[PDB]
């Protein structure tokens, strides 16, 4: 089983730099080309450089000389792609693949992609996230089934991590995209049971905050 | 740099209606050994970017072939004969013939389903919040379709435009249907002052705003 794992997301300062890993696994690391691939707000791809382990030989986009450095540790057979002076433009998701083009069969092997690596370069402030619970008043939507919610204020940077129940509660949950305002984010998420599940039995959110080590358990009480 | 031009931008198309996606490129794409490296990726909501075809018609091994790929010189053209709910996501063009790699703009792909009216649910503030001297009234706008959709809030019969932060999810793959959430913040001071809060909303299931309120006062 073929594995690409990136590190976590980074916050970063403006004209400092970062070195983003890509551990790979189940596969001779010396014996393909590893990419790199950047993605901006959604849909908007850029191809930034490769490299061939086993010789440390390495092409790059124009546009990436110097901001880019690639090397790789054939030892731990992890991928390494260093960012130099951050600025607005490098703030994005970063990938690494083992693309499978082989140059000398002129055909392929199949591609497999780390989970990417999101980079926010600024300069605001980390902050700790305040968590509300939602319960009903009106948002009852009556009898048979009734939607609770959980409110993530404040924080900064992203990502959190929002869970119903420790994640038993999977089925019927929204979590919506965090939302930026006055550099801080708001998030929230919707969970919808049927009313003989609640509030007879509790119902929790429960939020994660890596950057602050924050982590909160909110009970939906009536 | 080659130019990579994708049309159209989204597309709609209902489960077991076949789709097709259109790549232009700047250049021709015919390289110097007389291949053609032009490569389709689909990338799902919250998945990493995944090759569907190599060498312009070439599928990937694990691709279905309900995908097909054609073209040559400048042309290529993406198409699925019958379309799935697991099709969800962008497709991407992307040429290797040319140095550096580029990649076309996207194709997003959404499931057309039935009209679905929203279901609303509306929270007043959390005495949490009310203690730390702020305010927000939230409304879930869950499981509608089309995406198309607009909420005001009225405070006491007018509208209110400035501390709303609204937040859409993408199509889910489960019932093809959208979801959004809107907040309202204020001031604990501002809310004990008004009495009736209403979340609005226009869409196409209804000729009238569908309405979802509730008014404070004490008891
Ligand atoms: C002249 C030249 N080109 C080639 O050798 C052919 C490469 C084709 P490939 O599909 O691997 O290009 C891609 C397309 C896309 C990506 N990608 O998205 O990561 C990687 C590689 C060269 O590189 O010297
Ligand atoms: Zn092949
Ligand atoms: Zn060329
Ligand atoms: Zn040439
Ligand atoms: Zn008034
Ligand atoms: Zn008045
Ligand atoms: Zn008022
Ligand atoms: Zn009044």
């Known amino acids: 089983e073929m594995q690409l794992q990136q590190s976590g997301a980074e916050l970063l300062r403006p004209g400092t730099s970062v070195k983003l890993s890509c551990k790979t696994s189940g596969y001779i690391f010396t014996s393909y080309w590893i990419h790199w691939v950047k993605q901006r707000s959604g849909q908007g791809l850029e191809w930034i450089a490769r490299?061939?382990?086993?010789?440390?030989?390495?092409y790059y986009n124009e546009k990436f000389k110097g901001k880019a450095t690639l090397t790789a540790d054939k030892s731990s057979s992890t991928a390494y792609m260093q960012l130099s002076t951050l600025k607005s433009e490098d703030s994005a998701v970063y990938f690494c693949?083992?693309?499978?083009?082989?140059?000398?069969?002129?055909?392929?092997?199949?591609?497999?992609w780390g989970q990417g690596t999101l980079v926010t370069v600024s300069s605001a402030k980390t902050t700790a996230p305040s968590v509300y619970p939602l319960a009903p008043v009106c948002g009852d939507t009556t009898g048979s089934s009734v939607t609770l919610g959980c409110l993530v204020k404040g924080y900064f940077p992203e990502p959190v991590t929002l869970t119903w129940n420790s994640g038993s509660l999977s089925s019927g949950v929204h979590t919506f995209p965090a939302v930026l305002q006055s550099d801080l984010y708001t998030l929230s998420s919707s969970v919808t049971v049927t009313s003989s599940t609640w509030p007879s039995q509790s119902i929790t959110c429960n939020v994660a905050h890596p950057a602050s080590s924050t982590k909160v358990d909110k009970k939906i009480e009536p | 740099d080659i130019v990579m031009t994708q049309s159209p931008l989204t597309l709609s198309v209902t489960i077991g209606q076949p789709a097709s996606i259109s790549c232009k490129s700047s250049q021709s794409l015919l390289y110097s050994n007389g291949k053609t490296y032009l490569n389709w990726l689909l990338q799902r909501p919250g998945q990493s970017p995944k090759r569907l075809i190599h060498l312009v018609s070439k599928l990937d091994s694990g691709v279905p072939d309900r995908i097909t790929g054609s073209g040559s010189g400048t042309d290529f053209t993406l198409k699925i004969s019958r379309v799935e709910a697991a099709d969800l996501g962008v497709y991407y063009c992307?040429?290797?013939?040319?140095?550096?790699?580029?990649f076309g703009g996207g194709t997003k792909l959404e499931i057309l389903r039935a009209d679905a009216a929203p279901t609303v649910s509306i929270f007043p503030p959390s005495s949490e919040q009310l203690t730390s001297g702020g305010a927000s009234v939230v409304c879930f706008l869950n499981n509608f379709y089309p995406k198309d959709i607009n909420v005001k809030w009225k405070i006491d019969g007018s509208e209110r435009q400035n501390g709303v932060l609204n937040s859409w999810t993408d199509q889910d793959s489960k019932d093809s249907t959208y979801s959004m959430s809107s907040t309202l913040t204020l001031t604990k001071d501002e809310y004990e002052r008004h009495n009736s809060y209403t979340c609005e909303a226009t869409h196409k299931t209804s000729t009238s705003p569908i309405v979802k309120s509730f008014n404070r006062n004490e008891c």
């Open positions: 992307v040429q290797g013939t040319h140095f550096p790699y580029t």
């Open positions: 693949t083992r693309w499978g083009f082989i140059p000398v069969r002129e055909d392929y092997v199949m591609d497999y």
């Open positions: 490299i061939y382990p086993g010789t440390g030989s390495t």
